[PDB]
Each structure stands twice: as structure tokens, then as C-alpha cells.
Design a protein around this nucleic acid. Structure first.
Lengths: 47, 73, 81, 151
RNA sequence: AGCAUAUUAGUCAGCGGAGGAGAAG
RNA sequence: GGGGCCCAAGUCCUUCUGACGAGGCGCCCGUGGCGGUGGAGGCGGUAG
RNA sequence: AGAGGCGUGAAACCGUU
RNA sequence: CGAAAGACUAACGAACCAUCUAGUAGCUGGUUCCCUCCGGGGCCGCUGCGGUGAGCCUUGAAGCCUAGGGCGCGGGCCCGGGUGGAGCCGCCGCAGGUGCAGAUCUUGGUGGUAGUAGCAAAUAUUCAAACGAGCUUUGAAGGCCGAGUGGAGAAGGGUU
RNA sequence: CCUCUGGCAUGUUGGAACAAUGUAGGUAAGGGAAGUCGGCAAGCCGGAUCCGUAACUUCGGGAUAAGGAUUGGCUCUAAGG
RNA sequence: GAAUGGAUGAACGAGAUUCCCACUGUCCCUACCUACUAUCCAGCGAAACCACAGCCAAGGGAACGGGCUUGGCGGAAUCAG
RNA sequence: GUGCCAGGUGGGGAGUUUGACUGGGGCGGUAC
RNA sequence: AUCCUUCGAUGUCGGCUCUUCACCCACUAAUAGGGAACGUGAGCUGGGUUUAGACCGUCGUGAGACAGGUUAGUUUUACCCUACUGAUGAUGUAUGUGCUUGGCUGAGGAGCCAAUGGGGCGAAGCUACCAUCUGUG
RNA sequence: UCGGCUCGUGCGUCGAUGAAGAACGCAGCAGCUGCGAGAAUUAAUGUGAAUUGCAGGACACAUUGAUUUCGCACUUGCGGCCCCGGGCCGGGGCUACG
């Protein structure tokens, strides 16, 4: 039992839980080395 | 049994997401107070997109001109 | 190697818990990721019989108690009523 | 390296970093095998893995039990660190492969130098009464060895 | 050097209303 | 009142260096003596 | 690279000679 | 709010949050260089500014290391050597967020303890084979759960 | 308590040994609370069937008071639709 | 000391007290057995605490020292308690 | 009844105070 | 009596164990008196005493007080150093056998499960002033 | 040291034509940032041959020419009025208070 808004929030939170693309490490001024990753057990969503 | 045992009975949410401020602010006016300047600066004009005020600044720098175009080639 | 998927599918298809995978056909199994029915038909995976729980002892004592045995003062735990 | 080889031509080296094996056990085992002929060291480490020969624990011997085999070393405390022995066996295999790569005589190699340094510690956590959290730290080690020809 | 008038102070917090200044005149 | 595009003069000789330094001509411009370029008045700039 | 995904690189502490 | 214990009010004889607030304290703790005199002097030291040194420096600045040579009663300083790679210092003045061993000081790092305490609630594992560099899987035994250690949902989680 | 359907691998490991002290269980001759602040804990009783049951009482109770006997296996008899 | 209630009186009470029966390792007086630890090993691996440390006698001393004084003396590294 | 003032009542509530010396402090005492 | 030490804590009565007192009963040969931080709580226990609940008496207008009585009331940590007890070492050429309950293996023969199913008898070993062993110039 | 702090100067411009703020979405291959279903930007003007982590723009040589959601209600719940198209479905415009 979910609402549409909760489900959309969950979908957005799911689409953000991926590693960075590797080619971004090759850019000219890149300071990132890895991804704000979230684990369902380690950290809980704001609900 | 007021500690660990009582923490297991946590099933019903007091709060949910707000439709105006998005936090988990029905009064027409916004909730803001002078005794928390940190809270005031966490949400103020400039912490968002300003998707209308920046254009206002750009148009002020030229006198709010409208109905004209740069001279055609 | 690991046959968890094959055993789970075999249990679901056979409607049992009781699944016997042939210990010698471990390579003809493990490439049946969907085919479990085909392996059932040729006997490579079988349904084992139910472990026996006979009622012969129960029937024999029930007959003995019909004749009237094990029903004395020393065998009663409840009141008459 | 520390203590560069005296005769660099007739010598080989082996190295390893951030080895997740206990520093203290490794240090004791390396001190036990130092100066040995490479065949003798290999046999000794296999015996350690088989509980046939001991490793004397001389400095980090707090609470270490006593064994009849430690008497071979003039010591009372000894153990059989399996992981340290297997790591050192790997490193010696690499060292003798390097020696073969340079045309050295492996059957006459002696462990001239060996050194175990502490590596950066690895963090985990353990949970303690009354809602506390304490560190559970791995103490890995760097290891280096230099084998030199002597006969 | 306690404390009640006093002081802190018409100040902090609270409410309402602006302008490019306001208010005043 | 805005916006845009421009406008002086060494990369000279020897030499150090991994590559605006040093020694000379002090040479050249100067109403022009901050930044970049592998310690610069002699690329953007600056003055007018 | 006695600069190796990191300028220099002290002390506490440890290994080895 | 309390069938009353000042009990409970998100781990209470007046909740929690922010502000007033750096609240006040005759009270506890700490309060940083040297020498001299009685019972002031620092060709001591740090950071920056005005002047000056036709000062120093990639033919190597600062910083750091050093069982090297020295100076000073000392605060300290000079030189040798190393490694380091880009700036720095003397003198005359000016200025200050200017010198630490303490404060159950703040932050960060690291020891001995120590390969130590320990990895002991819920009866229990064994044989063979397979993959593989090296408690998993399969088969066979022996066991356990027996208002379940079974099969399904609600709340919660959010892709597990 | 034991089993079948279903499920699991002994609950953050394993091996060797079987010292003390411990935690959790079991037994103990003769005595029987002498122990201890105190029979603490732990041990006696315990189910059914047939007998029997005091003081006192608000006549409801007390009451499973207290106390005694019996209980297996097997083969029958009688009764109960 | 009399609804700041006085007195009593069955049933009831994880309420306080005394005695008796029965029972028993509570005790005389301890012993043995089982399981899990502890123990040793492989793997893994904390914390509390810490001026410096860590053998005594007496003396004096902030009137009970570990160090000071005078004596006694003192022998690596450890393990289980 | 309401508005304003006046008198009473008002630990229901508010704020505050409840000396010093002293063979510890309190009681006593006054050597205040 | 004093207030020198300790109030950023030296655990506090008694008993028990090991190297209050009083009164009475009995035995004994005698049932002497004391100290060791009123020896001894990381040795125990927690009856007393010194929190918070509650009752009574007295006192107080009251909130409350009472070396006045009553009842119920969490006793933490050693793995460090030393001391001590022991231990290495250093220097110096019968699950046995019957019986038995419930269940299970189709029955029997045979067995198993019930964290040792219960019970009888019981080898070895261990062990008791619960020894018909020894104890000195 | 592409950041702060402090001082000074000029200006001093939000919103029902719907703001500040929030949500969601948008790139050939998460965040920040930039944008709004025309979504990593369209047009115009100036500038002038790049963008770049990776191949992928015929860049007319007049190098035109590279560089949404936040009438009644808040569950996408339920309407009403007028038009348009397709045969009830879809589209557009309206419908807050003072």
C-alpha cells in the first residue's frame, strides 16, 4: 500500500543509488573519485 | 522497559511530507522567527532556483525594456 | 556446482517440498535454468516418497482398549466427568 | 629497502604491502626464519603449518602458552602461526622466482635481511554493553626480504 | 555585592505595515 | 548612460637550467615601470 | 616516483641494522 | 493526565528546541621568553607595515634532519653536512590575535595494557563426490522445530 | 513428550584436553534446621478412583481441610444403542 | 481510643511474625558425576586504566611510604590462579 | 449585565526574604 | 577532649571465613583477655544503620520532624603491578546389565528418541574420623 | 591560495500577467550546476572557428556561422458550464475570497 507521491519519491531515490560513470574520471578538472550512496539497511530514508 | 523494549513499538508516523516546504512552514503566512537565524538562512530568497528574480535583475540592468529587438542584420 | 535454482524449480513443479536430484547427472542438471519438466520426465529429478508414519501401533492398542485394556485406575488422568 | 644488499649482483629482493596478517605473529615468524637457507626456511615454515616446529614468541609473548618445541630455540613460549607462515612462504616463492629471473643459484640463497613493518590499521566496530561502540582494528603489515648467495 | 522601587529597557523575543529611503515637517 | 572591437616597445648576443635568471647592447617604448606564460615594462592587459 | 593517482614531510610510536 | 507512586507526558519535584546569553559567581581550575635590581635591560624570539642593506637566492629560499665546528650567564644564534624545491633575511622605526607542560584544556594522531579479555543462552553433527588456486552444492546418514524454526498478510522498510 | 507435511543446520568459528574457581543440572551413609537475621533454596506432596474430613463461619464456605486405601499386564463376566 | 473512626469477624493475600508435623547437603562434613566455560591451539580481536613506577622493617614526615634515612636485601623472560 | 474607579477577601497563583559570631552546625548564650 | 590528614569519595555495624554485648542451657581441662585502618564488602551476606513507597505514636496551623517503633527496598569492575600459591625456565666449562512409561522404525528378534526419560544393582577410579594406617630424639 | 573577513562606492529593481520556496523531470554515454515536455536549452544580436572524457555537425564560404506539479478536496479523488473533434472518449476555455 503506497501513494503515488511516496512511490515517486522512492523511484527518485532509487535512480540516485548508482556509481559514477567511469569516464567522468577522465575530465580536465575532475575532483570526484566515487559517489552519496545509500544502503537500505545502513541509512534510512526521510520518512 | 522504557528503553529498548519500548523502542520496538514504533509503527505510526506523526509527520509526513509537506506540500509547501517539502519537509517531513495551511496558514497563509510562512512560519519564521527571529530567534533562529540559522533556520531563517536555511530557507530564504537565494537558497532556491530564483527562477524569476535573476531574470528581474538582468532586465533591471537594462531598464525593463520590452517590445524591441536588437537591430536586424 | 550450485543447484539451488534447479531444486527450487523442481519443488515448485512437482508440488512437493522431497526433491531428489540425480547425484551423477550434475551437469545435465545446472543448465535447466527454466526444462525441469523435461528432467522430471526422463527421471533425472524425482519426487521422494513420504517418510513413513504408520498407525499400526495405534490401531493395535485401540483394539486392545476396545476389549478393555489400559483403562484401569492407573491409566486415567481426567475426572469421570 | 632498509639495509641494501652488500653484494647487489648476487642478491634478490621481495616485498609486500598492506598484508592482512597479524603484525606480531609475522614479526616473530620472520625473526625465527632470519638467516636460514631458503630450503631450510621453506621446510621450517611448512613444519610450522603442520605443528611440527614452533615459532618462538620472544617479545610479543604476553599470554602466549608454552610448548615442548620452543625448547629447540632456548625459549619457553611458542606458537604455530599458520597465516604468517603461509604469507612468508608466498613471499619466499616470489623471492626465489626473482632469483631465477636473474640467473642466481637458488640452492645457495640465504635470507640475509627480513623486516616486518606496521601498515595502516583497518577499522571495524564491535558493540558493547550499555549502548557503546568500540574499535575492532586489523593490524596489517608490510614485509620485505633480501636473499643473498652464500656458499 | 541581599532584594521588592529602580536598573537591565521601551531593550531581546512576539504581531502588523512599507519605501528606495522611511518617518518628520 | 550601456554594449562591442581595437591601438608602444627585445623573445637581440653569450651563458645557467628540466624549462621571465646572470653578464652585455646598458638596446627599445614610456602620458604605458596586475595577471598568464615550464623571478618578465618589451600574450592579455596598463596610459591616453 | 628517495613526486606512483601522490609538494615538503617533524614528533609521539614501531621494525631493522 | 494520574484506582495517587510526584507517577507518566518519545531512554520529569516543571519535558524538548532556539534565542535572550559570552546570563552572574566574594567560589574551583589554569594563565605562555631570559637575565638584572628591590622585596629595568634584552645585536632574546614570532607575524606584518614604512625606510634602508646597488642585501641573499634554481651555481638552490623557506621548512625539516644531524653521536659535525663553535658563540652567548641564557632567552637564543652562527657556520658545516644532508634533502628540499621558491622564495627569504639583516639594521633604523612602526604595529600586534606575538612565546605553553599543565587548565578532568580543544582538535588530531599514537602507545603500554595486548595477541590479552574474549568470539560459552536455544541437544548435533558424519561419510562420499562435484566445482574450485584454495563452513558451498548434490547424494546418503544421524538429529532438531513439532500456540512451529511451517504456509500467508497488516504497520514499517523501499528494491532488500 | 514423541512423530508426519513443511522447514532447518544448532544461531559471530573450529580443534585438543578434561586442573582449579565458576554457571547450570544429579546423587549422597548416619543425623534431620544443630545452619541462618530468617528453612534462603530445594526437597516432601502432587493425577485419577474409593472412603473420610475439624475448629470456626457472613451458613455461601473452610474443603483437594486433615487422614487412609488403590492404580501394571493379561483373560473374562455383566450392564449401557 | 471511638468515620483524624474504636472493637470484632468468615473468605481471601507472590503482605509481616511464632510454633509443630513431614521433608530435606541449610548444617555436622564434605565427596563424586554430567553439560557449558575457564585451559592449550588455528583464525579474529577490544576496553577500563596509566606523573614515574612497583620487595620489606622501623624512623621522621601533611601525625598509616613505593621512592627519602638507617637497616633487611636484590638474578633474564614468563604461565595458570 | 457590561465598561471605569473605590473598599474588602484572596498561598488559587507571582516574586522575594528567612542576620552574624560560634572549639562543626543546630539548641543555648551575646563575648554585636 | 582536639580538628593534623582525607569531602575531584580511603565503601560504614555486625556476623561468616582465614592467618557488639548480655543472659541461659550443656559439654569441657579450660570454655582467658586483646590487636592487626574499632583486621577482613572487586571475600560473602545485608539482619541493623543512611535515599526514594507506606503505617503508628508524639510534635508542628501546615509543608514536614523524631540515634521513637514498623514493613518493603539494584551490594558494580581485576585481563595491570606487587604480594602470595603453585608451573616452566635464567646464570654458572563403564551410559555395564536388568526392569519400565510415551513415541517411532509394518510386527519381531534388535533398537532409537524424550538437552542423562525414569528406576534397580553395579567394575574401575575418586573419595569420608563415614580409616580395625602412622606421628619421634 | 579561483576562499573568507573588514571598510568604502554606485544602484537600490519581488508577486494573481501568479513570487520566494518545494517537488518531479530533462544530456548519446550519479552529484553539483543549468534548464522546463521547445527541458544540459529555442529565437535574436554581437563575436568569431571551436566543444572535448570518448568515434558521432556537410559548420549553406552569401563559413547563418562552430563556439511541468505544488472549481471542491488534497486521494494526481470528484465535479459543473460553454465550445471543438472522434463515437462515451479526447482537446480548449472558464468556475477562490475580499
Amino acid at each position: 500500500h503506497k501513494t503515488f507521491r511516496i512511490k515517486r519519491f522512492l523511484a527518485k531515490k532509487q535512480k540516485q543509488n548508482r556509481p559514477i560513470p567511469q569516464w567522468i574520471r577522465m575530465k580536465t578538472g575532475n575532483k570526484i573519485r566515487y559517489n552519496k550512496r545509500r544502503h537500505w539497511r545502513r541509512t534510512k530514508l526521510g520518512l | 522497559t522504557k528503553g529498548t523494549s519500548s523502542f520496538g513499538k514504533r509503527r505510526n508516523k506523526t509527520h509526513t511530507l509537506c506540500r509547501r516546504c517539502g519537509s517531513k512552514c495551511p496558514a497563509k503566512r510562512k512560519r519564521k522567527y527571529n530567534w533562529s537565524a540559522k533556520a531563517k538562512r536555511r530557507n530564504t530568497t537565494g537558497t532556491g532556483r530564483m527562477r524569476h528574480l535573476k531574470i528581474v535583475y538582468r532586465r533591471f540592468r537594462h531598464g525593463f525594456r520590452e517590445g524591441t529587438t536588437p537591430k536586424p542584420k | 556446482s550450485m543447484l539451488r535454482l534447479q531444486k527450487r524449480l523442481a519443488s515448485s513443479v512437482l508440488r512437493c517440498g522431497k526433491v531428489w536430484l540425480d547425484p551423477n547427472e550434475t551437469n545435465e542438471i545446472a543448465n535447466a535454468n527454466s526444462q525441469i519438466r523435461k528432467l522430471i520426465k526422463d527421471g533425472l529429478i524425482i519426487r521422494k516418497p513420504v517418510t513413513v508414519h504408520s498407525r499400526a501401533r495405534c490401531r493395535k492398542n485401540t483394539l486392545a482398549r476396545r476389549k478393555g485394556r489400559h483403562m484401569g485406575i492407573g491409566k486415567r488422568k481426567g475426572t469421570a466427568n | 629497502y632498509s639495509l641494501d644488499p652488500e653484494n647487489p649482483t648476487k642478491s634478490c629482493k621481495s616485498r609486500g604491502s598492506n598484508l592482512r596478517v597479524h603484525f606480531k605473529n609475522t614479526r616473530e615468524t620472520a625473526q625465527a626464519i632470519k638467516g636460514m637457507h631458503i630450503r631450510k626456511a621453506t621446510k621450517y615454515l611448512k613444519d610450522v603449518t603442520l605443528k611440527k616446529q614452533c615459532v618462538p614468541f620472544r617479545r610479543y609473548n604476553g599470554g602466549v602458552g608454552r610448548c615442548a618445541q620452543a625448547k629447540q630455540w632456548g625459549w619457553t613460549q611458542g606458537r604455530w602461526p599458520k597465516k604468517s607462515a603461509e604469507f612468508l612462504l608466498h613471499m619466499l616463492k616470489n623471492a626465489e622466482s626473482n632469483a631465477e629471473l636473474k640467473g642466481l643459484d637458488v640452492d645457495s640463497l640465504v635470507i640475509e635481511h627480513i623486516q616486518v613493518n606496521k601498515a595502516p590499521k583497518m577499522r571495524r566496530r564491535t558493540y558493547r554493553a550499555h549502548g557503546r561502540i568500540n574499535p575492532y582494528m586489523s593490524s596489517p603489515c608490510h614485509i620485505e626480504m633480501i636473499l643473498t648467495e652464500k656458499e
